[PDB]
Structures are given as structure tokens and as C-alpha cells.
């Protein structure tokens, strides 16, 4: 009865569209305010950049991608305290009672 | 609509995001949300699926 809740493990997640901030080489790190929030999936990376895509220098430019995370379906985990287990036992005698 | 008895050592090693019961943050979201290498200025996500 009422086992203690330990963890929720999520197996179905819906995402929102990714958001990108990026900067040219030697122009600093890219920042998103979504990156300081605990419900967003984010990542830092560097991308190849140059004259062909809007940068004066050829090299690794900072880039950050963030998407808002919500759990759609999650499995719950409860701990089992063996000292709280209940059982029910049914007993009866052969005395000629009709099964009804 | 389903339930089982599972080993704690198995469950704690699941490569899935997990929460702490309350209105808690989702930890290790990357087990279902990966990001792919950027091309120039564009990254799209890899949703690993249900």
C-alpha cells in the first residue's frame, strides 16, 4: 500500500523547434537565455565558417542550439519496503455448502 | 497500463532522461534529444524516438 516514489524515467518526449545563436571566428561565444533554464536541451559546438557564409575569417565559430523539452510519457519507479508487504489468505471448510 | 518488478541496478542505468518526482528538472535529456554536427549556421536535432 502506497510504495515510496523514487524516480520518473521518461521514454516519450516532444520537442519544440530548435533555436540557434552563432558567431564568427574570434568574435566570442554565442549565448541564448534558454541555456540558463533547466527544462531546455542545449549544446555548445563550433562550426566551420568563412567568407562563403558571412565571416571575415576562416575558422571555427561558436554556435549554440536549444530546444524546449517536455515529457509526454514517463515510467514511474517505486521502492518496495518488504516490511510493509500485505497478503490475504482465504480459508474454508468442506461442509456441504452449495457454491452459491 | 502496465507494471513490473525490476532490478534497481537495471533501472538506474537506463539510458533515458529521469526526474526526481516533484516539479523537478529533467536530468540527462540527451538520452532522447541529440544534436547533429552543424553545417554552417544550422543545427537540427535528432529525436531518438519513443
Amino acid at each position, epitope marked *: 500500500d502506497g510504495p515510496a516514489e523514487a524516480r520518473k524515467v521518461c521514454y516519450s518526449a516532444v520537442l519544440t523547434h530548435v533555436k*540557434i545563436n552563432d558567431k564568427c571566428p574570434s568574435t566570442g561565444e554565442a*549565448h541564448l537565455a*534558454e541555456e540558463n*533554464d533547466g527544462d531546455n536541451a542545449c549544446k555548445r559546438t563550433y562550426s566551420d565558417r568563412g567568407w562563403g557564409n558571412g565571416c571575415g575569417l576562416f575558422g571555427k565559430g561558436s554556435i549554440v542550439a536549444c530546444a524546449k523539452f517536455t515529457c509526454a510519457k514517463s515510467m514511474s519507479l517505486f521502492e518496495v519496503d518488504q516490511t510493509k508487504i500485505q497478503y490475504v489468505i482465504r480459508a474454508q471448510l468442506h461442509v456441504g455448502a452449495k457454491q452459491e | 497500463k502496465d507494471s513490473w518488478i525490476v532490478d534497481r541496478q537495471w533501472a538506474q542505468d537506463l539510458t533515458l532522461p529521469w526526474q526526481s518526482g516533484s516539479g523537478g528538472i529533467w536530468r540527462e535529456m540527451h538520452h532522447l534529444v541529440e544534436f547533429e554536427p552543424p553545417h554552417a549556421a544550422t543545427i537540427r536535432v535528432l529525436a531518438l524516438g519513443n
Partner: antibody, heavy 116, light 112 residues
Framework: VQLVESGGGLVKPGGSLRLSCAAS????????MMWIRQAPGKGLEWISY????????YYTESVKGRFTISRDNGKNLLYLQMNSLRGEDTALYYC??????????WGQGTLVTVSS | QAVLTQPASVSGSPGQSITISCTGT?????????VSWYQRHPGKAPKLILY???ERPSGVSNRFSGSKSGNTASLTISGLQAEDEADYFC???????????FGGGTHLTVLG
């Protein structure tokens, strides 16, 4: 933290206009910007949408080939270049910030009326 | 698609509590649950009063509350005041394709 909008007025159909949005009070270059408008008797409608760097651009199909959203992060300015103007483009246009996948802050609005 | 329909005009008396609903009619709304409400006095900028259905921006009064049940998001204002005479716009992130969708708009009338 405010957004000032300018550029509105009266202009003939098939004309050309440029709306402007000046931002103050935060790092403009780290926030998604976007243009909204509202027509008479019609609900609000976001029409243009740009990323922090300007490398990601989104339009609605109603203004896709005509409007061109741009941003100058040195001047903390957001522009809406409205070419090939039409009658239905008569609306009150807002510039708005976008963080946390919501429309956070708004400008006061500039009015464009197009009359033949 | 995604269509948000809300009443054109609602009214209440000072000191009363009033509710403005926002009924969703699209394909799959019910997926992200980040509905936002906005307040606009005539000639000024819209002001964010609620986002993520119930959450409130810093400095927003506690008389403004919001809830959801199914395809309807509701904005409720208690302790009605003459300052609340304004337009209230509903907004919801529909999907990854078309983004946020707006309602038609409701004009609150405070019976002063």
C-alpha cells in the same frame, strides 16, 4: 527594456515601405525578433521571424515573397522591408522579442494604411 | 491548421471576478501547453500577463490567473478594477510548422 517602432504611414498599392524597430535595455544580438500585425476585425498574426544572428528566417505564406525581415546588431535595429504592397497589408505592425518560445515583449505599434 | 476562438466582448462589475476563455480548434494543439495571455490598452504596447498557461511574469498582480482543461485555456481576473479596461489576447504555440497562433481578441468592459 523597450522597443520603439517607426516607418508607418499612407502609401499607394504596389508601393514600397520599410518599418524600423529600435531596441534598448538588453543584448539585442542574443534574442529572436519578429514582426506582428493586426488588421481591422482580424486577430493578431505574426508575419516575420528572425533568429538572434539573423541566419534563420521565417515568413508566413501571405508575405513570403514580398516582405524581407533583417536586423543590424551593431545598431540594435530590426527592419521590415515591405515590397509589393497590397491592400490587405493595412494593419498595425508590432516588433516583438521572442525568448523561451513565447512572445515576451512588444513595441507600441506603427500604423500602415494603404489606400488607392 | 490552428484557430483560437475567444468571446468578442465580456463585461463585469468592479470587485467581481471574470473569466475569458480561449477555445482551440486546430489539428493537434494539446502538445506543448505554453499558452500566453496579453493585455493591451488603446494606443499602447501589449503587456505579457500570463505564459505557460498558469505562470506569471515578474510584477504582474495576483488577481490575474490562468488555467486549462482540454482544448480551452481560460484567463480569470479577480477583484475587478477600472484599470483592467483593455483588450486581452490569447496566444498558443500550435506546432513546429506554423508556430504561435493568436485569438481574435476580447474587450473587457468594467461597468463603472
Amino acid at each position: 527594456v523597450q522597443l520603439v517602432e517607426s516607418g508607418g504611414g499612407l502609401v499607394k498599392p504596389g508601393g514600397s515601405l520599410r518599418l524600423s524597430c529600435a531596441a534598448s535595455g538588453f543584448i539585442f544580438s542574443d534574442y529572436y525578433m519578429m514582426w506582428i500585425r493586426q488588421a481591422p476585425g482580424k486577430g493578431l498574426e505574426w508575419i516575420s521571424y528572425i533568429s538572434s544572428s539573423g541566419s534563420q528566417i521565417y515568413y508566413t505564406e501571405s508575405v513570403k515573397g514580398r516582405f524581407t525581415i533583417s536586423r543590424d546588431n551593431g545598431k540594435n535595429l530590426l527592419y521590415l522591408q515591405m515590397n509589393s504592397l497590397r491592400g490587405e497589408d493595412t494593419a498595425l505592425y508590432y516588433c516583438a522579442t521572442e525568448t523561451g518560445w513565447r512572445i515576451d515583449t512588444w513595441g507600441q505599434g506603427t500604423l500602415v494604411t494603404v489606400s488607392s | 491548421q490552428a484557430v483560437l476562438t475567444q468571446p468578442a466582448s465580456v463585461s463585469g462589475s468592479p470587485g467581481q471576478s471574470i473569466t475569458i476563455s480561449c477555445t482551440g480548434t486546430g489539428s493537434n494543439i494539446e502538445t506543448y501547453n505554453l499558452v500566453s495571455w496579453y493585455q493591451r490598452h488603446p494606443g499602447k504596447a501589449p503587456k505579457l500577463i500570463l505564459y505557460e498557461v498558469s505562470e506569471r511574469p515578474s510584477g504582474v498582480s495576483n488577481r490575474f490567473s490562468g488555467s486549462k482543461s482540454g482544448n480551452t485555456a481560460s484567463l480569470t481576473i479577480s477583484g475587478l478594477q477600472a484599470e483592467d479596461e483593455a483588450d486581452y489576447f490569447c496566444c498558443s504555440y500550435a506546432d513546429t510548422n506554423i508556430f504561435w497562433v493568436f485569438g481574435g481578441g476580447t474587450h473587457l468592459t468594467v461597468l463603472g
